[PDB]
Each structure stands twice: as C-alpha cells, then as structure tokens.
Design a protein around this ligand. Sequence first.
Ligand SMILES: *[C@@H]1O[C@H](CO)[C@@H](O[C@@H]2O[C@H](CO)[C@@H](O[C@@H]3O[C@H](CO)[C@@H](O)[C@H](O)[C@@H]3O)[C@H](O)[C@H]2NC(C)=O)[C@H](O)[C@H]1NC(C)=O
Ligand SMILES: *[C@@H]1O[C@H](CO)[C@@H](O)[C@H](O)[C@H]1NC(C)=O
Ligand SMILES: *[C@@H]1O[C@H](CO)[C@@H](O)[C@H](O)[C@H]1NC(C)=O
Lengths: 42, 41
Amino acid sequence: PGTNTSNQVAVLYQGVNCTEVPVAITWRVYSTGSNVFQTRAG
Amino acid sequence: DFGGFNFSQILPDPSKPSKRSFIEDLLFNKVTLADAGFIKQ
Ligand SMILES: *[C@@H]1O[C@H](CO)[C@@H](O[C@@H]2O[C@H](CO)[C@@H](O[C@@H]3O[C@H](CO)[C@@H](O)[C@H](O)[C@@H]3O)[C@H](O)[C@H]2NC(C)=O)[C@H](O)[C@H]1NC(C)=O
Ligand SMILES: *[C@@H]1O[C@H](CO)[C@@H](O)[C@H](O)[C@H]1NC(C)=O
Ligand SMILES: *[C@@H]1O[C@H](CO)[C@@H](O)[C@H](O)[C@H]1NC(C)=O
C-alpha cells in the first residue's frame, strides 16, 4: 500500500510454485512462511 | 417470457462449470490457443 500507510509489503513470485521458494531456503527472510498462498499468478 | 423471443443460446448455462453461453462455448472451442502459462500444468 502507500508507503505512509504502512511499510508492510507482500511479495509475489510470478510463475513460481510455492514449493520452489522453500526448496531454495537476495533476502530470504520471507521464505519462512506462515503466509504462503499459492495463486494462479505465482 | 420475453414476448416469444429466445435468448437461450446466448444466455448463461448454469449446468456447465463455466457460466458461458452455448455460443460462447462454441467460440472458445473454435479458437485454439498456445502457451497456456498456467503454472505450467
Ligand atoms: C429457446 O432456445 C432454443 C431455441 O430457441 C430451444 O432449444 C431447444 O428447444 C427444444 C424445445 O423448445 C428442446 O430441444 C430438445 O432439447 C433436449 C435437451 O438438449 C434434447 O435432448 C432434445 O433432443 C431436443 O433437441 C430444448 O428445450 C432445447 N434444446 C435443444 C438441443 O434443442 C429452447 O427450447 C427454447 N425454449 C425457451 C423457453 O425459450
Ligand atoms: C499518505 O499521503 C499523504 C502524505 O504522505 C498523507 O497526508 C496521507 O494522510 C497519507 N494517506 C493515507 C491513506 O494514509
Ligand atoms: C504447482 O502449483 C500448483 C497450483 O497452482 C499445484 O497444484 C502443484 O502441486 C504445484 N506443483 C509442485 C509443487 O510440484
């Protein structure tokens, strides 16, 4: 959202399956999970 | 009761998983695409 609204962000890995990012584990702290959501876009 | 006019072939068909009409299904079948790009399924 707007930067002044909040510094919280979400990351989309386009065309990437939610198993490949855990498999790999560039910042990787987001790879921990607890919010992973597989979409048709990535 | 549209005064005797028929719109069944262009109105949605609830039966199918997709709510496309008969003619819309016809068009989608006729046109063939490539490189789906859907999680490479
Ligand atoms: C409005 O839409 C179309 C034409 O305007 C009609 O479609 C077909 O109409 C007849 C009777 O009206 C029926 O045909 C039968 O359909 C069954 C189911 O597919 C099929 O097994 C039979 O062999 C026969 O073909 C049916 O209602 C309908 N479907 C087909 C394939 O013809 C429709 O009936 C019209 N009805 C209304 C309320 O507007
Ligand atoms: C963000 O834009 C301006 C300046 O940052 C600020 O006045 C405004 O209140 C902020 N908008 C929202 C929805 O927080
Ligand atoms: C790839 O993503 C789809 C969901 O879009 C999933 O069904 C499938 O299991 C995944 N394939 C893997 C993890 O190998």
